Every structure is written in C-alpha cells, then in structure tokens.
Amino acid sequence: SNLIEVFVDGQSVMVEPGTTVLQACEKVGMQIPRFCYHERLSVAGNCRMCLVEIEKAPKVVAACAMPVMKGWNILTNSEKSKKAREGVMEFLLANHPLDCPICDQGGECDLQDQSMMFGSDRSRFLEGKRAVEDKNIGPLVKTIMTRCIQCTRCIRFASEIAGVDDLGTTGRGNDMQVGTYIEKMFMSELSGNIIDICPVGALTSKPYAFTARPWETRKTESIDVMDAVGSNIVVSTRTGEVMRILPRMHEDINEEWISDKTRFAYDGLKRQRLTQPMIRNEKGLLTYTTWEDALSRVAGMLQSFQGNDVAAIAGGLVDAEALVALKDLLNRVDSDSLCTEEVFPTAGAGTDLRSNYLLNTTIAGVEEADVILLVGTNPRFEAPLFNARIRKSWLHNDLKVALIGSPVDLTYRYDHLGDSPKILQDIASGNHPFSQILKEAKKPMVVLGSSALQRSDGTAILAAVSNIAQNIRLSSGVTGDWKVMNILHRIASQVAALDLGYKPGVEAIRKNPPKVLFLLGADGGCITRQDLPKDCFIIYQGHHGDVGAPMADVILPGAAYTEKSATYVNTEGRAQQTKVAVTPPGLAREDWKIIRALSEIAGMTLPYDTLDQVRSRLEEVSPNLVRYDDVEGANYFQQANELSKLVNQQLLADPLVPPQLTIKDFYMTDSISRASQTMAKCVKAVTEGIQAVEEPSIC
Amino acid sequence: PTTKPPTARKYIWTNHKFNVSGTPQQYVPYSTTRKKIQEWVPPSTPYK
Amino acid sequence: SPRFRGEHALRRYPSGEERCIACKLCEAVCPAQAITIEAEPRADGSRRTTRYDIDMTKCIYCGFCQEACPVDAIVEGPNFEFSTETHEELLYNKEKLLNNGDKWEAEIAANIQADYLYR
Amino acid sequence: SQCLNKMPPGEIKVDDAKVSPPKRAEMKTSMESLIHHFKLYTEGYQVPPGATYTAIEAPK
Amino acid sequence: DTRPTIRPRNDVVHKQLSAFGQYVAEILPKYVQQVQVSCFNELEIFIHPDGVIPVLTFLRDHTNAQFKSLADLTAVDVPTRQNRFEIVYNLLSLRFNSQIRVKTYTDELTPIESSVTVYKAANWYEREIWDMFGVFFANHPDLRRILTGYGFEGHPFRKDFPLSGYVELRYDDEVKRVVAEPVELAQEFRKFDLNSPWEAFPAYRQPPE
Amino acid sequence: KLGLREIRIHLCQRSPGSQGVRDFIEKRYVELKKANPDLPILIRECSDVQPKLWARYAFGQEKNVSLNNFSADQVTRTLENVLSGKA
Amino acid sequence: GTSVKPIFSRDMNEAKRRVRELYRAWYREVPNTVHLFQLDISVKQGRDKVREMFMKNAHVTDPRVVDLLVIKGKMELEETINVWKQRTHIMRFFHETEAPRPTDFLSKFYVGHDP
Amino acid sequence: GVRTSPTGEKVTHTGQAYDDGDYRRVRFSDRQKEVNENFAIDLIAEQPVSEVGSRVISCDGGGGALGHPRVYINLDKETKTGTCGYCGLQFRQPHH
Amino acid sequence: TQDTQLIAVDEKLDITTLTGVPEEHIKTRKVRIFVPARNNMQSGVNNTKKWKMEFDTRERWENPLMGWSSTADPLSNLVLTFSTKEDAVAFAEKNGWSFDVEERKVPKPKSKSYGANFSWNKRTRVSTK
Ligand code: SF4
Ligand code: SF4
Ligand code: SF4
Ligand code: SF4
Ligand code: FES
Ligand SMILES: [K+]
Ligand SMILES: [Zn+2]
C-alpha cells in the first residue's frame, strides 16, 4: 500500500518508504562497504565509505543515511562509486599505523578486507604518519588509539546500548581523538562488546591479547550458561583449548551482544578443575582414585541407604540431561527429595503451571510493551541482556519503567515507586497512583526477579504480583494474549529443573535431613554438613570445586558447558542446546554418563544409554525440552492465581534489596567466574580505583 | 673472513659446535609451553 | 648461492631482542603445516612466541616462511649438513631454532645483506 | 641463445599487489603494501569462479 | 599498453567458438543440454549422460570437428547437487588446433557408457574416475583400482572422505607383517578458516533465493 | 508404596485432539489441587503433542495413558481412577 | 522420479543370484589362498570370514547397491587370484593387531569420552 | 638469565621446566635440555632509552629493509617511555 | 528418458556400504546442518550464505613428545558446503548420518532514520556526534 519501487543496478526492488539506500542495496544482495554504520547503533555518516552513485545525479550520496526515493537506480559498481571508495580508503589508510603483524584484528580486520576488495594496491603517501597516546579504560579492553579510524561506533554504543555516556571525542581536525579525556574506566556489564564494535584493532580483548589468530580457530556454536538469558555464543577453540567467546546474532535472546561475565570467563575453565575422581582416605584426606573405586563406593552407599534419606541438591550450572538422570536414579530408590539451590514459592500452583515460573511474554516482547514494573530486581546485573532489551525499548518506544526494589543504576531513568513490599499491595488495591497508569497502559508488563523470591516472604511477593496482574487483567485494556506476569530467573539451571519436577527450594533437606546427599554442581553453599546428620555421605559431581567438593567425600569430576552437548532452558522457556567444543580435562566425563554408569554399577540401570536416548527421556518428562529454539507459550494464569489466593502469606517490613547492586557484585557469582582470574582483575579495578589497571598496552 | 670479517654481535656464539648427533650433547625435542589446565589441589584439613 | 635454502633459524635484532613477534604469517603460509606457534604476552609486554616449533621431518624447504615474515625473523640458513641419527632430533623447538640463529648469524646476516635488494 | 640475447628490461611480477606480493621494501614502509602482503600470505588472492584446462608442451 | 597487467582478450576466437557451439547444438539437439564459451575462450558443452558415446563420436569423426585426442577425462564431485559426480571430457583437435570440453553429470549409482570404444585412451582414465570417485562405467574392458592400494575401502577424491583417510599402516613384529590400524595422527591437520566475509567479485553474484 | 508419586499431563496448545484436556485444565483443576495439595500434577504443554497422561509411581514406574480426543468429563474420569486406584 | 536406471540386475532376485555366484567363487577360492599365499589361518578360519563379510552388508535392499558390491567383491576376488593382494593385504581382513574394543556402556565410560 | 629449577632442570625464557614428578624428564638424561642462554627478556632491558626531542618518532629497527616495518610512536605521556612494538626499543621526550 | 527397462527403485537411496566408512564412524557421529554465523569481529555477511555440514568434536589430547593436538577422529576437519538445506539433509540421509538441522537465522529488517538522531520530543536524540 506504501511500497516504493527503487532500482539497484537496474533490478527493481519494493522498499518501504524510509528505507535507506544501504538496506535497499542489501535487499538485492549487494553489501555496501561501510565502517561507521552498525545496524544496531544509530546512523552517523562520517566514515564516508558507503558513498554510492545515484543515476542522473552528479553527487555520490551516503547510502548509510540517504533515504531512497521513487525511480532511483543505485549504481553500486559505477566507476564514480569505485573511485570514491578508493579515495576514501586511501584517506583512511594514510595515517593508519603499520601494526598489522602486531595487531590482533589481523585476519579479521574490516579495514584489511575492504582494502583487499574495495581499495587500491599501493600508496601515494610520502609523509610522516600521526601517532596518538594510548588510553586506559580498564583491565578488559586494551586500547591502541593510533589505530582508531574515528568511526565513533564505540561512542554511540556506549551512549545508547550501554547507557553510560563516558566515551566521546576530543579536539578537532586530524588531532581529534576518541576516548574518555579524564581517566575513567569504561565499566559496564556490556563493556566488552565494544571490542566487537571496533572495526579496527584500536579496541581489543585484553585476555585474548596475543594468543591466537582468527584464521586458525575452530568456531563451535553454543549457549551461554552464566546468566539465565541464554545468549547464543561462538566458542573459538584451537588445539583443543578454549580461546575466546564471541556473540552470535539471535535477534531475540541477545541481539548480537553478550555480557562481560559471558565473554571473559573462559579462563575460569582452566583453573581449580576437577579432573580425576577423589575419595576420602583413612585420614579423611581427598586422594586421587580410579573411577571404579569411587563409583563402587557411591553405588554401595546408594544401595544400603534408601527411602527419604537419599537426596540431591542440583547446582546452578547443571544441564538438563544430568537433572533427569539424577531424578530417575533417586526415584528408583524412592527418593523424591530433589532440591535446587534457588528457592521459588511452591505454595499454591507452584511448578505445576509453567507460566508461574516463566518470563511468558519473551525477551523480544519487551520491545512492544509500554509500561514495565520491575519488582525487587536489578536486571542490569541479574540479566544484562534483558536490561539491554529494556533500554532498547525505552529509547525508541518510549516505554515507562517503574521499580519497586531498592534504587539502583539501571542506565535508563526509571520511576522509583519505593522499596517497601507493602507498595505492591497498594497497587493491588488501586490506592497507589501508579495503578491508574497500569490500568491505562495497553501493553503492561510485570516482572518479578527470582532474587526477590529468595526471601522468606517469596510466597507473599508472588501472591501480591499475581494480584497486580489479575487486577490489570480484569480491565480488558491489556490486549488478547499479552501475558503480563513474568518471573526473571538468574540461575541458568532453574527453569529446566522446575520443568522436570525438582523441588523449587532446599527446604526438603532441612525438613528431612538425608544420610546421603548428591551435590550435583551445587556451589551456592546453602546447606552444609552441620544441617546434615552426622556420618553423611556427600557426593559432589562438578567441574570447579570451590564450595562443594571440599565438603564432599567423592568428587566425581563432571563436564562443563563448553565440554558437553546438553540442553539449557532460559528464563523465557526457550530450550537451547550447547555443543561440544573441547573434551573434558583429565579423567572427567559427561554428567549424564556419570549418573548412568553409577546406576549401572549400583544395579538399578537407567534405560537410556545414548545422548539421543536421554533426550527422548527428557521429552517423556517434558515435551517442551526438545523443541529447540521454540518458545512454548504457557497459559492458565487464572488457575495459578486462584491457587495462589489460598495461603494468605504476609509480607514483611524488610526492603526488597537485590543481592547485586554494584558492578563489583556482577563479576564473581558462579563457580567458573570465581575460579577465573580476569574477573578478579575486574573486581579489583572496580573496587579500589583506576590505579590497578596500568599496563604496557603500547604493543 | 681475514679480509672482510663478519659483523660482531653479543648473541653470536664463540665456539662453533659441530654436528652434535650421536654424542650425549644431542638435541631432545620438548614442549616449550607451560600447563593449560590446572588442578584443584584438595585441602589438607580432614574436616569430615 | 646466498639464496640457498637450508636449516631453518630464528634471527634477532642487533640489540638482542628476537625479531619474531608471533604474527603467525609463516605458520599460515607453510604448505606443509610444519610450523606450530603459540603466543603469549611476555612480562615486559612485547608479544613473543611461547612456542615456536618447526618440524624438519615435515618441512619442504620452500622458503615461503622467510618471504612471509615481515620482520625477517625466520630464515632458511645456509647449513645443510645437519643429518641426525634419530628422528626426534629433527623436531625443532624454539630453543633449538634460537640456537641456530645465534650460531649461523654471521653467515645469515651476510647472506641477507647480499640478497635483500633482489627481494 | 635467443632468450639470452633478447632479455628485456622491466619488473618480475604483475604490478598488482592483489595477485603478487609487494616488494619487501614497500611492505615495511607503506600501509597498502603491508595489508596486501598480510592478506596474500595469510588468505591469498581470490580466483574468480570458473574452470579452465591449460596445457603446455612439457619436455615429456 | 593501456592494460599492461590485464590479460589480453581475444574476441575473434570467442566468435569462432560460439559459432561452433551453435553448430554442435544444432547437430545433436537430442543430448546437448547447454553450451557456453568462457571469458578466456574455452567452449564447454553440457550434454545428457546418455550422449556420452554419440556426441564424442561426432566430435571425433565429423569433418568440421576432427577432435581426435582425448587430452583429459576427469570428474568433479559437488555434494550439494543431486547427481554429485560431474564427468568432464577434454578433447583437442589437431587439424583445427582447438580444445573442447564435454561435461556430463551422474550420481553415485548411475552407470556411464565407457568411452573406450571411441577414445581408446579413456581406458585408464575411466578406471581412475572409478577409483577416486566411485562412478561405475559399464561396458568397460576392465574396471579396477588404478591408484589406491590393494584392498582399499572407499573413494578418496570424494568430498565426504577425510584427507587423512581412516586407516594408516604400520609394521608389527608380533605378526611380522605390515598391518593396518585405525588412523591416529601425532598432530591433527589444523583446519584454517581463511575466507573473507566481504564479497569479492560483483560479476559472479548469485541472485537471492 | 505406589502412593501416586507424580502426574504429568502433556497436552497440545492448539490441536483439537487436546481440546477436551484444555477444558479440564480450564475448569476441573483448581478443586483437584485443593483436594490433594501435595501432588506434583505437571501440565507441561507443548506444540504438536498428542494429549497424554503419565502416572509416575514409586520406585520409578510410569504408565502413560493417552488422552487423544477426550472430553473434559472423559479426562476427569480417566484421571480419577488413577489417583483413586492407589491406597 | 521413483524409477531409475539399473546397474546389472533388474530385481532383487537377480542381485541375490549374483551374490550367490560371488560367494561360490570365494568359497571355492579360499583354500587356494590359504596354500598359495602361505597363510597360517585354517581353511575354515577363512571361509567363515568370507561368510561374515557377506553377512555384514546383508541389510541392503536397493538392487543397484547390490550390483555395486557384487562388482567390488569381484574385484577383490580378482586381486586375490593373481597374487595382486599380498599376505599383509589379505591378513587385513582378520584384524589381528587391533586390540578388542568394548561394547558395554560402562567400559566405554571407564576408558574415554566417546559415544 | 637462565636459572636452575629445584629438580635441576634449567628454565627457559618461556618459564618451562618439567615437574619433579614428571616422567618426561627421562628424555633429558644422558642428554641436555636445549635452552638458549641469551634471554631476549633481559637483553632488551639494558638497551638505553633514546632521548628523542620530538613529540612522535619513527622506528624501523635499523637498517631500513633489514629492520621491521616503520612505525610511529607518540611520546606524550611523561610517566612512561614509548616502546616500539616490533623491536622493544624505548624512547622518551627530553624531560618534556 | 532412459529406455533400458527403466526399473522402479522407490526405496530410499543408501550408500553406507559403498563409501568405505568404518562401523564406528557412521552412526555414533552426528552431523550438523547449519548456516554459519557471521564473525562478530567483522561486519561482512558473505560467509553466511551457504549451508555447512560438520561432525561432532571428539577427543583431542596432547602429544607426549612435543605437545601437538593429537586426535583419532578422521571426520574432524571435514566440513561440507551446500547451497540449500534440503540438499544438505539429502546428503546426510544418503550417507546414513544422524543430523540436527538448525534453521537459518536472518537479521530482522531494522528501521534507520538520520532525523531521529535530532528528534525534538523523543528520547532518541543523541547527546553527541
Ligand atoms: S586494525 Fe590492525 S589488522 Fe587492521 S589495518 Fe590496522 S593494524 Fe592492520
Ligand atoms: S576506537 Fe574503534 S569504535 Fe571507537 S571510534 Fe575509534 S575505530 Fe571507531
Ligand atoms: S621453508 Fe620450511 S618452515 Fe618455511 S614454509 Fe617452507 S617448509 Fe615451512
Ligand atoms: S612470520 Fe616471522 S614474525 Fe611472524 S610468527 Fe613467523 S617468525 Fe614470527
Ligand atoms: S557507513 Fe555511510 S558513511 Fe559511514
Ligand atoms: K575490534
Ligand atoms: Zn622498532
């Protein structure tokens, strides 16, 4: 009804009015060369490489910012456009420093490739080049600013995507330099993404510095397990060793960004690893032993002790196959004490209804809502990609945010309604003024963080927010489907566990102390030996022994997310799978294989013997754990609300304080992050000051 | 070398060793890089 | 001739610092994949190979590495009488290549001096 | 004998840094020569799609 | 010259080759599927696999073709195609000093009539295509492995075949024999992913699908 | 003791074959949970899934029961015998 | 579409006929290999291996496939007849130097991370 | 400088020395651990830092084509000395 | 078409016995049909236009002598290319390899506008150039 016809090299293409010349060219397939244009960031038009020729027009237009009009024929390969590209690249390459052998961008440098394709093969520059003093912005991004082409893409990314306005320019002319002027580290959860944004080696990954070349690393696609967003990543490994994590575009989960805890945490999978099985000797000292001895010990203890004295506290980074394997193994000994480190209110519907513990309207739905109400959450650190999506919707759609928890730095400005739990009840009763806004918004959204559920009054908070959702649902201003209630999880191996039937808590252990405990990747340290009865057999199956394995008696080494092909479910309900990039170190094996072999040794052999068989069993327990990259929308909010309005649990007076309220708390959260060294340098950088990040970045 | 002597530098050797194959001064290949994966080094307190 | 291709060797600057900067052009251009390079930022800060192994039993002595090197770090020395009684002695390490560079430096510097203008 | 008596002056490789590496003197001085040398010795020159059968009178 | 680096282009040869391509297309419309002349003046005739014996014979016997020398006979394996194997015949005419290319297609389990009767030089060539790729040529005087070792299992030149194979050789003193074992390399072949993510040649730009 | 360890109802969202199951979970579920507020009745739904009922008993025993094209009363009846068939 | 060219046989029965005569040739041959090639395995110890090789690919049902392995087995017989294979080439059929591999899941889990 | 590990093995410039409880040391007995005594880490340290009197300076490594690609170092920070990324030579402004 | 008593061979094509692949490397492997993701380091999409088929990574240990990446998986560096997903799955079924095809992700068409950088009422107004 509005499509306008534009020509690209003669071909006729229907383009929506407002389409730029670059997108019209992309429709045909031609990719206009560019440096300063990023489809996620704003259009700048300063690189001047998108200069393309329009027929019957004696002026090369900027395809990155020029909207097409009817009858235009974009001559991409015209002689004038080719000469313009050659001149612009000559200007770019004039003052560039001869750092290609020493620059990590070498082999994946946009400048190098565009020079190879759209550019000359020599130089007519017979003068002295410029040189720019390097600038320090922390222990993550090494800056060699003499390589900067001043595309200002990092500045735009910091301003819009990251929110913090600490990057910019200084001066004019050839001496105008991109930096922070005063010394101030670019500290944000999404800071490392600037390394991807920079088309040149001006901004580079410090942990990856001078370690590998782009053409030699094997790329394996996988799913992040640090946070609960489930960002898709590419593990680049060479010589059977993880080298770096890059983002992979998904446009729903993480756009094309990742957090810092996702990027600079691969080193965590190189220290404090469990490689060979450990058993307690006659002094109670952990000693290396063959798999046979440890498995025999565990099998004997499982055979002897049965009933409710058998238990398993699933960890936070565990997969879905291992969870179902452990569930079946403990079910065959009639043990239904499968607990999880995280606590989710089981009162009322509980895990019975999926929508009770799911971010129902998906991450991509945030870009549609008009009012967002976050309750007792700090999405900046709990789920950095979710906060990035909220900011993205805040910029364009002018979405209005409202916080019920403690005041924090959420990049974008929010309206702090307060920090007391009682406010929720007010919004339920309509006494609070914001209720009017909630009833006036056509696409309202209510998000409750899983950290808020960690409190003693989690059931009361869930009941209050469900009352909010029902109150705004009875008024039909909310559109047809528009699932309002949302629960934002933090632990990756939570939703899947809640899908399988694991108890959303650890209270089963305290209520019924078991004489054997299967710590499966459990490192939160919620339950210790003091809570357990004496002479308790503790089994730890994990990769990094930090808070768990020291407590256990058998330290059966498990496999990590980069070392297994396994299913993880994000907070929206989508179930993705990570693929193997490196094999487990030493004698460590896959988690599900360990559980199945233990079941075989103990006698109660599990049916599944292959990964496909375990996936089939996962389908048997839950059919939505195999529909990979498919959000299975839940329903029946009314039933969950009706079951919720029976407990009448009373809110407390303690303010809703998120566990993480500063950058310092974001880094060292899980076992891999704790064992890593770069996150230690990061917490050091943020804690004391700027003096801890000085280094010779000249090379 | 008597007329034109080669340029002198510190790192250049001062005793031209011949083919050291056979003699116990052979060359044995070995990895010149450190470890990649570290171990957990379990604690010493019996505790349990 | 001064262009003769023989035993591979790693040269170094007159100051004493190695010329190699681990740009991995030689490893990326070797037709036989005979070079293995692992790099790591040194204590000073300069990027140098933590491992630079060249497998003489797999090398084809093409000289492509010495052309690819942008700092004239790796060269094919004039030595050709380096036969070994055991196979393992032909698997060159970084230390062995550096020893070759320090041993044949007098010859290799003159050979490059008499040929760099042709390149 | 004819080739020895008719050797012409000129260069040795096609004057195109995208199919022939630049001179070592130019590589260590200029941006484009360094970039082209890097890409040629790491990636190589992209040959246009197609197929050909070229034969010569080898001494066999 | 104005193009000291660009290879000179001959257009008279292009016209002659195009004329002969139309000639061959008109002569045998039964098998000739598509004829094309490359930019560097090489003519390729794509025929139906049933036209292997007839078309070649024509090109060998016609007064206006007189292609009496099978220079090369080879195959190219493209897994993404239905009939992956693509057999190529290169012929040279000494009377009209011209080279021609006749290219046919064939899947894994479809036979091709052996051109040994027409070109007796093909007899060895065919075996190679059988050994390297697995294309079986019916009506062949003797089809056998020509390059691979005796008892080899597989067709090495197939794309779905590792360059290191599956089996290596060793000498075992226990059996005093040159035994074969599963392959196990001391250093795995480092697969380099060298491919610029920027389009090289605008001319060969596949239209979007 | 097969004390009815867990119920798993796997119904499809949109196909008419699970329609009756939907009606059941629409209406005859709140009172069901009120009856026994300990049963982990699982309603894990998925697209393109034949409506089925799994009854995990003690010691890891399961008996799948198909609910294809069942009515709301039909699903109710086919579940009541399951949770009433245990002591 | 569903109907395609044949290699040699025009039905499964003729392919089975060709398999039968190929087995005929191999079974008649085996003792001649044992004597001529100076093998040390017993005659039956080669005939049963011929049987096992025939039984390996006993699941195929596409005729053209059956003709293809008929030709391949004919070629291997051809190599075995006119001493084109040698003692080592023939002995490769009996995988002798290869250590026995385990079949149960438990041993595979004990030995390494493989399917 | 090359130093001796507690086992007796000399450490290379890469900090490589086989552990005491490592069987690989068997290869070195009746042989020697080939190491290079001339450590590049030390040898570049005592090279004097040139007092360049300009804001920026060009380094080619000496010898023109014999050296490394010519790069320009910006000598503006008074707290550090500009070091060439190819050869390691340092430069410093004359007390600014 | 083909007049040689053209026979119906409806049953699906299978060359598992005509490739020479050993027993182990034909079902315990799992190929992966996927369109490679764009290298986020760069900004070119010319490497995301052809489907690729690859095999699961296996054990990669260190050589005791020098430390190489020794492996015993022949189908580790072998990756096929395909013009379309259907052809790739046809190749996978033809060779009898278990697969798990991932759909081709496509960048969603955005809506760029230079004017929004200098808006008067909206929050897209940039604070810098
Ligand atoms: S950014 Fe690095 S690789 Fe790219 S042109 Fe500059 S020095 Fe070379
Ligand atoms: S530092 Fe990088 S991203 Fe920032 S302006 Fe310079 S080239 Fe662009
Ligand atoms: S000269 Fe030797 S080391 Fe250099 S590329 Fe050729 S084979 Fe490799
Ligand atoms: S090409 Fe030269 S500088 Fe680059 S890695 Fe090889 S030896 Fe070192
Ligand atoms: S991309 Fe249009 S000018 Fe930078
Ligand atoms: K970059
Ligand atoms: Zn220098």
How many β-strand stretches of chain F?
A: 4
In the sheet with the most strands of chain F, the strands line up as 2-1-3-4
User: Shape of chain E from CA axes?
Assistant: globular
Q: Which class best fits the helix and strand makeup of chain F?
A: alpha+beta
Shape of chain F: globular
Query: How large is the radius of gyration of chain E?
Result: 22 Å
Tell me what the structure shows.
This is part of a larger assembly, with nine protein chains of nine kinds. Chain D is mostly helical and 60 residues long. In chain D, 33% of the residues lie in helices and 0% in strands. Chain D has helices spanning 2-5, 24-27, 31-42. Chain E is of the alpha/beta class and 209 residues long. Chain H has one helix at 40-43, and strands at residues 50-51, 56-59, 71-74, 82-83, 90-92. Chain H is elongated and about 55 Å long. Chain H starts with 39 loop residues before the first helix and ends with a strand. Chains A and I meet through helix 4, strand 10 and helix 10 of A and strand 4 of I. The structure holds iron/sulfur cluster (4 copies), FE2/S2 (inorganic) cluster, potassium ion and zinc ion. One iron/sulfur cluster binds next to helix 2 of chain C. One iron/sulfur cluster (SF4) is lined by residues 20-26, 37, 68-69, 71, 73-74 of chain C.
Per-chain topology:
This is part of a larger assembly, with nine protein chains of nine kinds.
Chain A: E1 4-8, E2 11-15, H1 21-28, E3 51-54, E4 60-62, E5 73-75, H2 79-94, H3 110-117, E6 141-143, H4 153-161, E7 168-170, E8 177-179, H5 193-197, E9 203-205, E10 218-223, E11 232-238, E12 241-247, H6 260-263, E13 278-280, E14 286-288, H7 291-304, E15 310-314, H8 321-332, E16 338-340, E17 371-375, H9 379-382, H10 384-396, E18 400-403, E19 415-416, H11 422-429, H12 434-440, E20 444-449, H13 450-453, H14 458-474, E21 485-488, H15 495-500, H16 507-511, E22 516-520, E23 537-541, E24 566-569, E25 575-578, H17 591-602, H18 611-621, H19 637-644, H20 663-667, H21 671-675, H22 678-687
Parallel strand pairs in A: 1-5, 15-16, 15-22, 17-18, 17-20, 18-19, 20-21, 22-23
Antiparallel strand pairs in A: 1-2, 3-4, 3-5, 6-9, 7-8, 10-11, 11-12, 13-14, 24-25
Helix pairs in contact in A: 7-17, 8-17, 11-14
Chain E: H1 12-27, E1 32-37, E2 43-47, H2 52-61, E3 70-77, E4 85-93, E5 98-106, E6 112-113, H3 122-132, E7 137-138, E8 167-172, E9 177-182
Parallel strand pairs in E: 2-5, 6-7
Antiparallel strand pairs in E: 1-2, 3-4, 4-5, 8-9
Chain H: H1 40-43, E1 50-51, E2 56-59, E3 71-74, E4 82-83, E5 90-92
Parallel strand pairs in H: 1-5
Antiparallel strand pairs in H: 2-3, 4-5
Bound molecules: iron/sulfur cluster (4 copies), FE2/S2 (inorganic) cluster, potassium ion (K) and zinc ion.
The site of FE2/S2 (inorganic) cluster (FES) has 14 residues of chain A, from loops.
Keywords (chain F): Acetylation, Disulfide bond, Electron transport, Membrane, Mitochondrion, Mitochondrion inner membrane, Respiratory chain, Transport
Protein name (chain F): NADH dehydrogenase [ubiquinone] 1 alpha subcomplex subunit 2
Domain Ribosomal protein/NADH dehydrogenase (chain F): 13-86
